[PDB]
Design a protein around this ligand. Structure first.
Ligand code: K
Ligand code: K
Ligand code: K
Ligand code: K
Ligand code: K
Ligand code: K
Ligand code: K
Ligand code: K
Ligand code: K
Ligand code: K
Ligand code: K
Ligand code: K
Ligand code: K
Ligand code: K
Ligand code: K
Ligand code: K
Ligand code: K
Ligand code: MG
Ligand code: MG
Ligand code: MG
Ligand code: MG
Ligand code: MG
Ligand code: MG
Ligand code: MG
Ligand code: MG
Ligand code: MG
Ligand code: MG
Ligand code: MG
Ligand code: MG
Ligand code: MG
Ligand code: MG
Ligand code: MG
Ligand code: MG
Ligand code: MG
Ligand code: MG
Ligand code: MG
Ligand code: MG
Ligand code: MG
Ligand code: MG
Ligand code: MG
Ligand code: MG
Ligand code: MG
Ligand code: MG
Ligand code: MG
Ligand code: MG
Ligand code: MG
Ligand code: MG
Ligand code: MG
Ligand code: MG
Ligand code: MG
Ligand code: MG
Ligand code: MG
Ligand code: MG
Ligand code: MG
Ligand code: MG
Ligand code: MG
Ligand code: MG
Ligand code: MG
Ligand code: MG
Ligand code: MG
Ligand code: MG
Ligand code: MG
Ligand code: MG
Ligand code: MG
Ligand code: MG
Ligand code: MG
Ligand code: MG
Ligand code: MG
Ligand code: MG
Ligand code: MG
Ligand code: MG
Ligand code: MG
Ligand code: ZN
Lengths: 68, 91, 71, 251, 114
RNA sequence: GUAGUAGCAAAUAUUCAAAUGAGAACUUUGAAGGCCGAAGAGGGGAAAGGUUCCAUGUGAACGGCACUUGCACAUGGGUUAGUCGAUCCUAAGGGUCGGGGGAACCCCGACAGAUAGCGCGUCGCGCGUACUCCGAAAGGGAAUCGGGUUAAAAUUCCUGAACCGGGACGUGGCGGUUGACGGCAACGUUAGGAAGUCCGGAGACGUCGGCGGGAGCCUCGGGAAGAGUUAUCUUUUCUGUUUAACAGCCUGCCCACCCUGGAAUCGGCUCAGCCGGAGGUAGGGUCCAGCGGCUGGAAGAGCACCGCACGUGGUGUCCGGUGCGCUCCCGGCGGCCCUUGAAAAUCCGGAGGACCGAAUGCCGUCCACGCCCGGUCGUACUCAUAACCGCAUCAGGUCUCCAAGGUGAACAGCCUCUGGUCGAUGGAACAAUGUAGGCAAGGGAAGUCGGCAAAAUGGAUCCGUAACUUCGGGAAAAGGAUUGGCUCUGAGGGCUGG
RNA sequence: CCAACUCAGAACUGGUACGGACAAGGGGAAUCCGACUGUUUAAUUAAAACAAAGCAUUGCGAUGGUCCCAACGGAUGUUU
């Protein structure tokens, strides 16, 4: 498992053809965006809840989004 | 203080093996465990690695010497004998 | 509080209960630590620090207080 | 009777030499054109201990005469050798401790070690710690040299035989008393299965000529003839004399 | 207290059967075999370690498993000789070569003497 | 016949109620009282065994009393691997070609000899020292971790997350001053030519002792959750309060190394050493270890607790201290040897630069990402006071890993927690003789071949200690004093603040 | 401000008890033998016997000493 630090980088990996699904984990102090790729599970942490919603609707169509 | 009157390093043998053997081995016991002058670097940092092998801690020079001393008495005589012969031949 | 510590409650030797080497190591580390800080604070010059360092190794000062008074 | 201890050693088995940790045979370079005519320079890389051998050994690196590669060698270390020293082998090598020269180029009275018996055999004589050979004289007509061996015997060898200048390092080893059975145990643990030794007079007749009797005693002269067959040849073999060596005998 | 057992059929405490105790998220202790200590690269003679290279088992140095920068030193004889050893050789090579030139020139002056 | 006789007796121990059954001192459940007491009567494995493993059932026999019982009998079920091993490598050694012996069975064993082949181009050149053999389920060694799951299997099954060795091409990146850039340096950065040949390192190594570091455990305090005790006392006692491989970043131990600088009124420094014009102290750096820190993995898991239903929801999983403590690992230094304490596979690096592109589009690329592939055999169970051997369910024999609290010098003995267990045929009496364990007035070896046996001495602290001696010892010589409980006093430290 | 447990002393106190169980040398004066540690008759002998360091003698310079082998060859010998 690897951690993505930039939202821009997370979007780039979310558009990969091998990205099988994306899962949204909402903790009590941040939201984690996890994208399952061929080799690694990339995770992005977004402390600001409001800033996380904008990224949630910006994901490419056709990618399986799940809420945890 | 003075821990032993005369036994010195051979006190590790206690009362065993007889006084003469302890006296006899004391000479070599002291010599093989002592530091020797290094002709190369100029330090008293030469100690025996194994019988006949003497290495300097500082400069790392390893020298073949006597079993329990860096230089045996015959070793000095041989060097002078060889040196004298070389001068005559190289004259 | 010091209860149950009399001669009738001791089975090992004093060394077995607390080795003399342990006590010596504590004292040297304490005294050498004290000398370094005085040298660092410039209370004592390296000339006096050297005199105290070897005396400590020589079993001259038995604790921190006596070392301070001599200085 | 049964096969005595002396007889069982020849079969090998548990009496073979213990050589697992030995560094290899210590010998001169193979005689070649460079040593026969000129000289070849080598460098001592390390002085090492060889289990079972008192004398230290020296690892020497040489430049191969005609191949692009290094040539590794293992010499019996001479007293005074040191790491980083240059060692010169050949006919024209200078007379200095550590160099290997043919006996023809070594003047009379020199101290040498690891002397060849046959030209090119790479050294058979004076190899133990503190031992050496002394060049006595040369015979240009016969092309031979006289040397004195450590035992005190004089031998004729061809002048082409090579020898290292100096004496073997590690001398004086046997002067130190062992003081303990265990020290003897460690000494022979890395040599061969020859220690401890049980006296024949302590055995039964079945296994030694000296065995048996209601008292421990040999019962017959311990001096046995040269031609005695194996199993009978025990004790002082072909003794020219016996008893304490006093007078010219101990010379 | 919880007591452990070997996780393999190796029942003897050999050097290759070393282990560490790890507490899992399940709240239990368990062994995990630990690889033996490795020396790492060392100088041919002095034996001092070669700086800049990690100490790993030989298979862990495999190119596919280790980045190139971690198994190399950017210098002549990098990873084989220390910096001091390289400096000694360079000076020795230059000075010895210069001395040969002096010897060559010196004998030419004596050669013409006739 | 002996004879229903000898005999059932080591390893502390059983009791009550109920269920089941034709039948219960012996099966099962519950309660109580004991034991093993972490070098175990606990939890595993190597040999060896071979189905003894699990479920159900059971006429007899067998389990030296009994049995409803089972390691017995009958029927059926059960062992899942690219990552654990074998497999590979070599060790002592073993088996061999040729050759030499030998009536022959056989003997020696690379020693009498046109080796095996390998590399690079595309069949040719170069290289080429007579074994491509066997030999380790403890030596060397490519890669897997939590969580869950069975009546019986799992690092093998399920889920999730990684890694290793191969194969193939694509996209992007990188280099062309044809083969990168940065740092005075130690070296740093993710890429960043290259053949035959050559060189080094790792693999790779004894033992003992002292210190230092890491992990796990033990231990102390606070917070919260449940439980125990409660006539009295107890802000109390107990249980727990979790974080895997792997990836990134940070940290930089003890050493080593680099730059500046130039040292006696010598300094620095360890428990001990020891270091310095061959450049110390000091100042500033580099590198190395990690079973160290943070984040991802990852709370979604696990555990505890409280609910609702009879699957589902909620809360918590927090903040510190302590050490000659214990187990394991590592670091560094020192002692010891007439003892110096394996090899090879494999992998990494280096020296050299034949040969090779482009006028900028090709060439090169150990970089990132994507795609494909994963043989065979072993795997159940016991590992022993009942699964191995001893003719047996024999008080014997049989390699090794994990190891809590109290007392104490102490994996001594004694007691306890986790786990295990009451399995040794039972009942009633309390004669002689016996076996094992004790005690005894006064005397004190008179006993006896003989102080055999037993008794006495015993830990620690202080004092004191002869002859003799190889000067090291003798020595714990001998001899004497002290020791509980309770309430106090003194001494011995660390980190911050000019 | 935070600390762990070693040492020393004093008062008081119990039917002089207190290393309270457990644990845990009897001591001394001599003779014989063997120096010592080690080893030995598995299942009647553990010793004064064996070994041992030390001491001494003997053979041998490889075309060799000692020894194995039916023969060929081999062990000591990776030796001097
Ligand atoms: K016979
Ligand atoms: K023997
Ligand atoms: K003997
Ligand atoms: K006799
Ligand atoms: K590097
Ligand atoms: K087994
Ligand atoms: K496999
Ligand atoms: K193996
Ligand atoms: K090994
Ligand atoms: K798993
Ligand atoms: K791992
Ligand atoms: K299995
Ligand atoms: K048994
Ligand atoms: K009776
Ligand atoms: K009597
Ligand atoms: K002993
Ligand atoms: K021979
Ligand atoms: Mg130096
Ligand atoms: Mg202690
Ligand atoms: Mg002391
Ligand atoms: Mg003898
Ligand atoms: Mg006899
Ligand atoms: Mg006879
Ligand atoms: Mg009866
Ligand atoms: Mg009986
Ligand atoms: Mg009875
Ligand atoms: Mg019983
Ligand atoms: Mg019973
Ligand atoms: Mg008991
Ligand atoms: Mg108990
Ligand atoms: Mg243990
Ligand atoms: Mg029965
Ligand atoms: Mg069963
Ligand atoms: Mg059956
Ligand atoms: Mg494996
Ligand atoms: Mg072999
Ligand atoms: Mg055969
Ligand atoms: Mg043949
Ligand atoms: Mg050959
Ligand atoms: Mg092979
Ligand atoms: Mg094999
Ligand atoms: Mg192995
Ligand atoms: Mg199982
Ligand atoms: Mg190496
Ligand atoms: Mg010791
Ligand atoms: Mg520690
Ligand atoms: Mg500095
Ligand atoms: Mg986390
Ligand atoms: Mg949860
Ligand atoms: Mg251990
Ligand atoms: Mg190059
Ligand atoms: Mg199993
Ligand atoms: Mg079981
Ligand atoms: Mg077991
Ligand atoms: Mg049988
Ligand atoms: Mg205690
Ligand atoms: Mg105990
Ligand atoms: Mg009486
Ligand atoms: Mg009485
Ligand atoms: Mg009396
Ligand atoms: Mg009498
Ligand atoms: Mg009488
Ligand atoms: Mg009498
Ligand atoms: Mg008695
Ligand atoms: Mg006495
Ligand atoms: Mg007498
Ligand atoms: Mg004796
Ligand atoms: Mg025996
Ligand atoms: Mg017997
Ligand atoms: Mg007996
Ligand atoms: Mg004598
Ligand atoms: Mg013959
Ligand atoms: Zn030197």
């Amino acid at each position: 498992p690897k951690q993505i630090h930039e939202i821009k980088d997370f979007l780039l990996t979310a558009r990969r053809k091998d990205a099988r699904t994306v899962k949204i984990k909402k903790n009590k102090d941040m939201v984690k965006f996890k994208v399952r790729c061929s080799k690694y599970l990339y995770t992005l942490c977004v402390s600001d809840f409001e800033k996380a919603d904008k990224l949630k609707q910006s994901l490419p169509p056709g990618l399986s989004v799940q809420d945890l | 203080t003075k821990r032993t009157k005369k036994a010195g390093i051979v006190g590790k043998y206690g009362t065993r093996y007889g006084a003469s053997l302890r006296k006899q081995i004391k000479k070599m016991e002291v010599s093989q465990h002592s530091k020797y002058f290094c002709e190369f670097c100029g330090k008293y940092a030469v100690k025996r690695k194994a019988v006949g092998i003497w290495g300097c801690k500082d400069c790392g020079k390893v020298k073949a010497g006597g079993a329990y001393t860096l230089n045996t008495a015959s070793a000095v005589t041989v060097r002078s004998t060889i040196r004298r012969l070389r001068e005559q031949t190289e004259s | 509080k010091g209860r149950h510590s009399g001669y009738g409650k001791r089975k090992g030797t004093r060394e077995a209960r607390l080795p003399t080497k342990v006590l010596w190591m504590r004292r040297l580390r304490v005294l050498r630590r004290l000398l370094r800080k005085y040298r660092e604070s410039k209370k004592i010059d390296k000339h006096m620090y050297h005199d105290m360092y070897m005396k400590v190794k020589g079993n001259v000062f038995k604790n921190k207080r006596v070392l301070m008074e001599n200085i | 009777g049964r096969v005595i201890r002396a007889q069982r050693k020849g079969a090998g088995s548990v009496f073979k030499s213990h050589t697992h940790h030995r560094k290899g045979p210590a010998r001169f370079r193979t005689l070649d054109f460079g040593e026969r005519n000129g000289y070849l320079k080598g460098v001592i890389t390390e002085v090492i201990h060889d289990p079972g051998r008192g004398a230290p050994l020296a690892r020497v690196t040489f430049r191969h005469p005609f191949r692009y590669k290094h040539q590794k060698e293992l010499f019996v270390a001479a007293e005074g050798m040191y790491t980083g020293q240059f060692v010169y082998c050949g006919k024209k090598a200078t007379l200095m401790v550590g160099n290997v020269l043919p006996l023809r180029s070594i003047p009379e009275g020199a101290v040498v070690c690891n002397v060849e018996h046959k030209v090119g055999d790479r050294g058979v004589f004076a190899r133990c710690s503190g031992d050496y050979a002394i060049v006595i004289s040369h015979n240009p007509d016969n092309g031979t040299t006289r040397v004195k061996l450590p035992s005190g015997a004089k031998k004729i060898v061809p002048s082409g035989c090579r020898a290292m200048i100096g004496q073997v390092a590690g001398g004086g080893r046997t002067e130190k008393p062992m003081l303990k059975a265990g020290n003897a145990y460690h000494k022979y643990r890395v040599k061969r299965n020859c220690w401890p030794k049980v006296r024949g007079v302590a055995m039964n007749p079945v296994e030694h000529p000296h065995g048996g009797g209601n008292h421990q005693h040999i019962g017959h002269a311990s001096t046995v003839r040269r031609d005695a067959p194996p199993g009978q040849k025990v004790g002082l073999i072909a003794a020219r004399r016996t008893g304490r060596l006093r007078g010219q005998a101990r010379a | 207290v919880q007591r452990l057992t070997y996780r393999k059929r190796h029942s003897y405490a050999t050097k290759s059967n070393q282990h560490r105790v790890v507490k899992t998220p399940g709240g239990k202790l368990i062994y995990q075999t630990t690889k033996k200590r490795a020396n790492g690269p060392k100088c041919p003679v002095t034996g001092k370690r070669i700086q800049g290279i990690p100490h790993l088992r030989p298979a862990e140095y495999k190119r596919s498993r280790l980045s190139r920068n971690r198994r190399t030193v950017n210098r002549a004889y990098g990873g084989v000789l220390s910096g001091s050893a390289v400096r000694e050789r360079i000076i020795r090579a230059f000075l010895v070569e210069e001395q040969k030139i002096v010897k060559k020139v010196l004998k030419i002056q004596k050669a013409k003497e006739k």
